[PDB]
């Protein structure tokens, strides 16, 4: 039903902001909630538990020269600018949020790390 995978993904980003930033828990709670909501809306029509790769490119969260637009706008709601995000988050991040598995990679050549796995 998407909640756990989205929650794990948002929990990861929130943890990066807590550790690297000086961001209050009030703000981190707003950020976590709003991002969970935003991604739930974004992923609604692009979530196929029986085919986890289907929609994987659409759902993937990327940070390059550009910040991911959903992260940017939710971050703005808690008073973080994109320049700040560029500094607080890893610079070459890919975060895949798929049915039964959330994983990520930092840098084009970095390891693939599994954040969340669960059995269908």
Coordinates of N, CA, C and O in Angstrom, one line a residue:
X1 N 0.8 -1.2 0.0 CA 0.0 0.0 0.0 C 0.9 1.3 0.0 O 0.4 2.4 0.2
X2 N 2.2 1.1 -0.3 CA 3.1 2.1 -0.5 C 3.7 2.8 0.8 O 4.8 3.3 0.7
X3 N 2.9 2.8 1.8 CA 3.3 3.6 3.0 C 4.7 3.1 3.5 O 5.5 4.0 3.7
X4 N 4.9 1.8 3.7 CA 6.2 1.5 4.3 C 7.4 1.9 3.5 O 8.4 2.4 4.0
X5 N 7.4 1.7 2.2 CA 8.5 2.0 1.3 C 8.7 3.5 1.3 O 9.8 4.0 1.4
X6 N 7.7 4.3 1.1 CA 7.7 5.7 1.1 C 8.3 6.2 2.5 O 9.2 7.1 2.5
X7 N 7.8 5.7 3.6 CA 8.2 6.0 4.9 C 9.7 5.8 5.1 O 10.4 6.6 5.7
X8 N 10.2 4.7 4.6 CA 11.6 4.3 4.7 C 12.5 5.3 3.9 O 13.5 5.8 4.4
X9 N 12.0 5.7 2.7 CA 12.7 6.6 1.9 C 12.8 8.0 2.5 O 13.8 8.6 2.6
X10 N 11.6 8.4 3.0 CA 11.5 9.8 3.7 C 12.4 9.8 5.0 O 13.0 10.8 5.3
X11 N 12.3 8.7 5.7 CA 13.1 8.5 7.0 C 14.6 8.6 6.7 O 15.3 9.3 7.5
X12 N 15.1 8.1 5.6 CA 16.5 8.2 5.1 C 16.8 9.7 4.9 O 17.8 10.2 5.4
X13 N 16.0 10.4 4.1 CA 16.3 11.8 3.8 C 16.3 12.6 5.0 O 17.1 13.5 5.3
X14 N 15.3 12.4 5.9 CA 15.1 13.1 7.1 C 16.3 12.9 8.0 O 16.7 13.9 8.7
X15 N 16.9 11.7 8.0 CA 18.0 11.4 8.9 C 19.2 12.2 8.4 O 20.0 12.6 9.2
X16 N 19.4 12.3 7.1 CA 20.5 13.1 6.5 C 20.4 14.5 7.0 O 21.3 15.1 7.4
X17 N 19.2 15.1 6.9 CA 18.9 16.5 7.4 C 19.2 16.7 8.9 O 19.7 17.7 9.3
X18 N 18.8 15.7 9.7 CA 19.0 15.7 11.2 C 20.5 15.7 11.6 O 20.9 16.5 12.4
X19 N 21.2 14.8 10.9 CA 22.6 14.6 11.2 C 23.5 15.7 10.7 O 24.4 16.2 11.4
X20 N 23.3 16.2 9.4 CA 24.1 17.2 8.7 C 23.7 18.6 9.0 O 24.5 19.5 9.0
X21 N 22.4 18.8 9.2 CA 21.8 20.1 9.4 C 21.7 20.5 10.8 O 22.1 19.7 11.7
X22 N 21.2 21.7 11.1 CA 20.7 22.1 12.4 C 19.2 22.3 12.1 O 18.8 23.5 11.8
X23 N 18.5 21.3 12.0 CA 17.0 21.4 11.7 C 16.2 20.8 12.9 O 16.4 19.7 13.3
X24 N 15.4 21.7 13.5 CA 14.5 21.3 14.6 C 13.6 20.1 14.4 O 13.3 19.8 13.2
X25 N 13.2 19.5 15.4 CA 12.3 18.3 15.2 C 10.9 18.8 14.8 O 10.2 18.0 14.0
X26 N 10.5 20.0 15.1 CA 9.2 20.5 14.6 C 9.3 20.5 13.1 O 8.4 20.0 12.4
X27 N 10.4 21.0 12.5 CA 10.6 21.1 11.1 C 10.7 19.8 10.4 O 10.1 19.5 9.4
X28 N 11.5 18.9 11.1 CA 11.7 17.5 10.5 C 10.4 16.7 10.5 O 10.2 15.9 9.6
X29 N 9.5 16.9 11.5 CA 8.2 16.3 11.4 C 7.3 16.8 10.3 O 6.7 16.0 9.6
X30 N 7.3 18.2 10.1 CA 6.6 18.7 9.0 C 7.1 18.2 7.7 O 6.3 17.8 6.8
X31 N 8.4 18.1 7.6 CA 9.1 17.7 6.3 C 8.7 16.2 6.1 O 8.3 15.9 5.0
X32 N 8.8 15.4 7.1 CA 8.6 14.0 6.9 C 7.1 13.7 6.5 O 6.8 13.0 5.5
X33 N 6.2 14.4 7.2 CA 4.8 14.3 6.8 C 4.4 14.8 5.4 O 3.7 14.1 4.6
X34 N 4.9 15.9 5.0 CA 4.6 16.5 3.8 C 5.2 15.7 2.6 O 4.6 15.6 1.6
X35 N 6.4 15.2 2.9 CA 7.1 14.4 1.8 C 6.4 13.1 1.6 O 6.3 12.6 0.5
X36 N 6.0 12.5 2.7 CA 5.2 11.2 2.7 C 4.0 11.5 1.8 O 3.7 10.7 0.9
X37 N 3.3 12.6 2.1 CA 2.0 12.9 1.4 C 2.3 13.2 -0.1 O 1.7 12.6 -1.0
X38 N 3.4 14.0 -0.4 CA 3.7 14.3 -1.7 C 4.0 13.1 -2.6 O 3.6 13.0 -3.7
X39 N 4.8 12.2 -2.0 CA 5.2 11.0 -2.8 C 4.1 10.0 -2.9 O 4.0 9.3 -4.0
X40 N 3.2 10.0 -2.0 CA 2.0 9.1 -2.1 C 1.2 9.5 -3.2 O 0.7 8.7 -4.1
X41 N 0.9 10.8 -3.3 CA 0.2 11.4 -4.5 C 0.9 11.1 -5.8 O 0.3 10.7 -6.8
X42 N 2.2 11.3 -5.8 CA 3.0 11.2 -7.0 C 3.1 9.8 -7.5 O 3.0 9.5 -8.7
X43 N 3.1 8.8 -6.6 CA 3.3 7.4 -6.9 C 2.0 6.6 -7.2 O 2.0 5.5 -7.6
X44 N 0.9 7.2 -6.9 CA -0.4 6.5 -6.8 C -0.8 5.7 -8.0 O -1.1 4.5 -7.9
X45 N -0.6 6.3 -9.2 CA -0.9 5.7 -10.5 C 0.3 5.0 -11.1 O 0.2 4.5 -12.3
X46 N 1.4 4.9 -10.3 CA 2.6 4.3 -10.9 C 3.2 3.4 -9.8 O 4.4 3.4 -9.5
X47 N 2.4 2.5 -9.3 CA 2.8 1.5 -8.3 C 2.1 0.2 -8.6 O 0.9 0.0 -8.6
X48 N 3.0 -0.8 -8.8 CA 2.5 -2.2 -9.3 C 3.3 -3.2 -8.5 O 4.3 -3.7 -8.9
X49 N 2.7 -3.6 -7.4 CA 3.4 -4.5 -6.5 C 3.9 -5.9 -7.1 O 4.9 -6.4 -6.8
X50 N 3.1 -6.3 -8.1 CA 3.4 -7.6 -8.8 C 4.5 -7.5 -9.8 O 5.1 -8.5 -10.2
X51 N 4.9 -6.2 -10.1 CA 5.9 -5.9 -11.1 C 6.8 -4.7 -10.5 O 6.6 -3.6 -11.0
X52 N 7.6 -5.0 -9.5 CA 8.3 -3.9 -8.8 C 9.2 -3.0 -9.7 O 9.3 -1.8 -9.4
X53 N 9.7 -3.5 -10.8 CA 10.5 -2.7 -11.8 C 9.6 -1.7 -12.6 O 10.1 -0.6 -13.0
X54 N 8.3 -2.0 -12.8 CA 7.4 -1.2 -13.5 C 7.2 0.1 -12.8 O 6.7 0.2 -11.7
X55 N 7.6 1.3 -13.4 CA 7.5 2.6 -12.8 C 8.7 3.0 -12.0 O 8.8 4.1 -11.5
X56 N 9.8 2.1 -12.0 CA 10.9 2.4 -11.1 C 11.7 3.6 -11.5 O 12.1 4.4 -10.7
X57 N 11.8 3.9 -12.8 CA 12.4 5.1 -13.3 C 11.6 6.4 -12.9 O 12.2 7.4 -12.6
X58 N 10.3 6.3 -13.0 CA 9.4 7.4 -12.7 C 9.6 7.7 -11.2 O 9.6 8.9 -10.8
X59 N 9.6 6.7 -10.3 CA 9.6 6.9 -8.9 C 10.9 7.3 -8.3 O 11.0 7.8 -7.2
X60 N 12.0 7.0 -9.0 CA 13.4 7.2 -8.5 C 13.6 8.7 -8.2 O 13.1 9.6 -9.0
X61 N 14.2 9.0 -7.1 CA 14.5 10.3 -6.6 C 16.0 10.6 -6.8 O 16.8 9.8 -6.4
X62 N 16.3 11.6 -7.6 CA 17.6 11.9 -8.0 C 18.1 13.3 -7.6 O 17.3 14.3 -7.6
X63 N 19.3 13.4 -7.3 CA 20.0 14.7 -7.0 C 21.2 14.8 -7.9 O 22.1 14.0 -7.7
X64 N 21.2 15.8 -8.8 CA 22.4 16.1 -9.7 C 22.7 17.6 -9.7 O 22.8 18.1 -8.6
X65 N 22.9 18.3 -10.8 CA 23.0 19.7 -10.8 C 21.7 20.3 -10.2 O 21.6 21.4 -9.6
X66 N 20.6 19.6 -10.5 CA 19.2 19.9 -10.0 C 18.9 19.1 -8.8 O 19.3 17.9 -8.7
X67 N 18.2 19.7 -7.9 CA 17.6 19.0 -6.7 C 16.3 18.4 -7.3 O 15.6 19.0 -8.2
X68 N 15.9 17.2 -6.8 CA 14.6 16.6 -7.1 C 13.5 17.7 -6.8 O 13.5 18.3 -5.7
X69 N 12.6 17.9 -7.7 CA 11.6 19.0 -7.5 C 10.6 18.8 -6.3 O 10.2 19.7 -5.7
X70 N 10.3 17.5 -6.0 CA 9.4 17.3 -4.9 C 10.1 17.6 -3.6 O 9.6 18.2 -2.6
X71 N 11.4 17.1 -3.5 CA 12.2 17.4 -2.3 C 12.3 18.9 -2.1 O 12.2 19.5 -1.0
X72 N 12.6 19.6 -3.2 CA 12.8 21.1 -3.2 C 11.6 21.8 -2.7 O 11.7 22.6 -1.8
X73 N 10.4 21.5 -3.2 CA 9.3 22.2 -2.7 C 8.8 21.9 -1.3 O 8.5 22.7 -0.5
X74 N 9.0 20.6 -0.9 CA 8.6 20.3 0.5 C 9.7 20.9 1.5 O 9.3 21.4 2.6
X75 N 10.9 20.8 1.1 CA 12.0 21.4 1.9 C 11.7 22.9 2.1 O 12.0 23.5 3.1
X76 N 11.2 23.6 1.0 CA 10.8 25.0 1.1 C 9.8 25.3 2.2 O 9.9 26.3 2.9
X77 N 8.9 24.4 2.3 CA 7.8 24.5 3.3 C 8.4 24.5 4.7 O 7.7 24.9 5.7
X78 N 9.6 23.9 4.9 CA 10.2 24.0 6.2 C 11.4 25.0 6.3 O 12.3 25.0 7.1
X79 N 11.5 25.9 5.3 CA 12.4 27.0 5.3 C 13.8 26.6 4.8 O 14.8 27.3 5.2
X80 N 14.0 25.5 4.1 CA 15.2 25.1 3.5 C 15.2 25.4 2.0 O 14.4 25.0 1.2
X81 N 16.3 26.1 1.6 CA 16.5 26.5 0.2 C 17.2 25.3 -0.6 O 17.8 24.5 0.1
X82 N 17.2 25.4 -1.9 CA 17.8 24.3 -2.7 C 19.3 24.3 -2.4 O 19.9 23.3 -2.3
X83 N 20.0 25.5 -2.4 CA 21.4 25.6 -2.1 C 21.7 24.9 -0.8 O 22.7 24.1 -0.7
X84 N 20.9 25.1 0.3 CA 21.1 24.4 1.5 C 20.9 22.9 1.4 O 21.8 22.2 1.9
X85 N 19.9 22.5 0.7 CA 19.7 21.0 0.4 C 20.9 20.4 -0.3 O 21.3 19.3 0.0
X86 N 21.5 21.2 -1.3 CA 22.6 20.7 -2.0 C 23.8 20.4 -1.1 O 24.5 19.5 -1.3
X87 N 23.9 21.2 -0.1 CA 24.9 21.1 0.9 C 24.6 20.0 2.0 O 25.5 19.3 2.4
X88 N 23.4 19.8 2.4 CA 23.0 18.9 3.4 C 22.8 17.5 3.0 O 23.1 16.5 3.7
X89 N 22.4 17.3 1.7 CA 22.2 16.0 1.1 C 23.4 15.6 0.3 O 24.2 16.4 -0.1
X90 N 23.6 14.3 0.1 CA 24.7 13.8 -0.7 C 24.5 14.4 -2.2 O 23.4 14.6 -2.6
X91 N 25.7 14.6 -2.8 CA 25.6 15.3 -4.1 C 25.2 14.5 -5.3 O 24.8 15.1 -6.3
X92 N 25.4 13.2 -5.3 CA 25.1 12.4 -6.5 C 24.2 11.2 -6.1 O 24.5 10.1 -6.5
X93 N 23.1 11.5 -5.5 CA 22.2 10.5 -4.9 C 21.1 10.0 -5.9 O 20.5 10.8 -6.6
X94 N 21.0 8.7 -5.9 CA 19.8 8.1 -6.6 C 19.1 7.2 -5.5 O 19.7 6.4 -4.9
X95 N 17.8 7.4 -5.4 CA 17.1 6.7 -4.4 C 15.9 6.1 -5.0 O 15.0 6.8 -5.6
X96 N 15.9 4.8 -5.1 CA 14.9 3.9 -5.8 C 13.9 3.5 -4.7 O 14.2 2.9 -3.7
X97 N 12.6 3.8 -5.0 CA 11.5 3.5 -4.0 C 10.5 2.6 -4.7 O 9.7 3.1 -5.5
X98 N 10.7 1.3 -4.5 CA 9.9 0.3 -5.2 C 9.1 -0.7 -4.3 O 9.5 -0.8 -3.1
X99 N 8.1 -1.3 -4.8 CA 7.4 -2.3 -4.0 C 8.4 -3.3 -3.4 O 9.2 -3.9 -4.2
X100 N 8.4 -3.4 -2.1 CA 9.2 -4.4 -1.3 C 10.6 -4.1 -1.2 O 11.4 -4.9 -0.5
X101 N 11.1 -3.0 -1.8 CA 12.5 -2.7 -1.7 C 12.8 -1.2 -1.9 O 12.4 -0.6 -3.0
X102 N 13.5 -0.6 -1.0 CA 14.0 0.8 -1.2 C 15.5 0.6 -1.1 O 16.0 0.0 -0.1
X103 N 16.2 1.3 -2.0 CA 17.7 1.2 -2.1 C 18.2 2.5 -2.6 O 17.5 3.4 -3.1
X104 N 19.5 2.7 -2.4 CA 20.1 3.9 -2.9 C 21.6 3.8 -3.3 O 22.2 2.8 -3.0
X105 N 22.0 4.8 -4.0 CA 23.4 4.9 -4.4 C 23.9 6.4 -4.4 O 23.3 7.3 -4.9
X106 N 25.1 6.5 -3.7 CA 25.7 7.8 -3.7 C 26.9 7.9 -4.7 O 27.8 7.1 -4.4
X107 N 26.8 8.7 -5.7 CA 27.8 8.8 -6.8 C 27.5 7.8 -7.8 O 27.0 6.7 -7.5
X108 N 27.8 8.1 -9.1 CA 27.6 7.2 -10.2 C 28.3 5.9 -10.0 O 27.8 4.9 -10.5
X109 N 29.4 5.9 -9.3 CA 30.2 4.7 -9.1 C 30.1 4.0 -7.7 O 30.8 3.1 -7.3
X110 N 29.1 4.5 -6.8 CA 29.0 4.1 -5.5 C 28.3 2.7 -5.4 O 27.8 2.2 -6.3
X111 N 28.4 2.2 -4.1 CA 27.7 0.9 -3.9 C 26.2 1.1 -3.9 O 25.8 2.2 -3.7
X112 N 25.5 0.0 -4.2 CA 24.0 0.0 -4.0 C 23.7 -0.4 -2.6 O 24.1 -1.5 -2.2
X113 N 23.0 0.4 -1.8 CA 22.7 0.1 -0.4 C 21.2 -0.1 -0.3 O 20.4 0.6 -0.9
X114 N 20.9 -1.1 0.4 CA 19.4 -1.5 0.6 C 19.0 -0.9 2.0 O 19.6 -1.2 3.0
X115 N 17.9 -0.1 1.9 CA 17.4 0.6 3.1 C 16.3 -0.2 3.7 O 16.1 -0.3 4.9
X116 N 15.5 -0.9 2.8 CA 14.3 -1.5 3.2 C 14.0 -2.7 2.3 O 14.1 -2.6 1.1
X117 N 13.8 -3.9 2.9 CA 13.3 -5.1 2.2 C 12.3 -5.8 3.0 O 12.3 -5.9 4.2
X118 N 11.2 -6.3 2.3 CA 10.2 -7.0 2.9 C 9.6 -8.0 1.9 O 9.8 -7.9 0.7
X119 N 9.1 -9.1 2.4 CA 8.6 -10.2 1.6 C 7.2 -10.0 1.1 O 6.4 -9.5 1.9
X120 N 6.9 -10.2 -0.1 CA 5.5 -10.1 -0.7 C 4.5 -11.0 0.0 O 3.8 -10.7 0.9

